[PDB]
């Protein structure tokens, strides 16, 4: 996210470091201010490129990053949150684990009786 870049630049000392992301960069509509800065990445969304240039910044390709900074200096690498993905909710499903079943339709009468309560036999 473009906010996740901003929170990395609020850090002490890291005002003027060319942030680097090997992946997509996405826009956010939950921030009403955003600093200047120079981002370097594979891809930008139409909204993220627009938000960076509107704040007087510059979107840079990874080959231009190599020309400006050959040994990689004054740089700050960022990585998106891997476990946030929905697939890993389900990994490790067993008893007393708190892990979500693989299930299409929800609501009561879709896995809430004999197994998830005292009143119906036992809890897990």
């Amino acid at each position: 996210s473009v906010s996740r870049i901003a929170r990395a630049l609020k850090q002490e000392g890291a005002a003027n470091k060319t942030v680097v992301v090997v992946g997509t960069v996405t826009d956010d509509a939950r921030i009403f201010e955003f600093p200047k800065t120079t981002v370097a990445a594979l891809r930008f969304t139409a909204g993220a490129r627009a938000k960076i240039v509107k704040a007087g910044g510059e979107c840079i390709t990874l080959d231009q990053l190599a020309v400006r900074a050959p040994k990689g200096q004054n740089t700050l690498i960022l990585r998106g949150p891997r476990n946030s993905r929905e697939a890993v909710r389900h990994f490790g499903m067993g008893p007393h684990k708190g892990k979500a079943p693989r299930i299409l339709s929800t609501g009561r009468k879709f896995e809430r009786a004999r197994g998830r309560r005292r009143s119906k036999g036992f809890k897990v």
């Binding site: 389900h90 499903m93 079943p101 693989r102 299930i103 299409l104």
Partner: protein, 193 residues
Amino acid sequence: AISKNLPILKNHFRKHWQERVKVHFDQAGKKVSRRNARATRAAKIAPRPLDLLRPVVRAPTVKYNRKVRAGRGFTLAEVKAAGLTAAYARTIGIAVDHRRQNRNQEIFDANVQRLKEYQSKIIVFPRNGKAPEAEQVLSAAATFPIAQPATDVEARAVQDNGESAFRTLRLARSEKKFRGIREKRAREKAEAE
């Protein structure tokens, strides 16, 4: 039968289902024939449009009652208000619906103007059959589009009375909930001397 950690599926195919499969191969042709029907129909009828002029209606339910949408026909009040007979209306491309009624004013106001506009922008020929030239416009619905009524304005001042909204919506429930229980007290306490 059951194995692994997969989800529980419900695929209904224990009946003789392969006897009743339909595959829409005709999709591409039915379009062309459906377009031939519209070109045929516009010949034999000639300068008239392909559709009747419909009214504006407000949709039902708590979900959709923001929208405005085309209804079936006008109403024997709305046909008369514009100044024409229910029998004569149908003959000039208007849809008259007998079974709707009018409880709302803001729509009734719209529908009269909607007819008033239409009634001005046509050319009714005499039965003699001299026929002055004109050429058809296929869609009335295109010519008289259903406008979407912008209710509120953009820039306004800030009024503050101070009952917190959330307090209103809780007292609204709390009053509703305890009506009959207070009626039962008020009716007994009044009659008991």
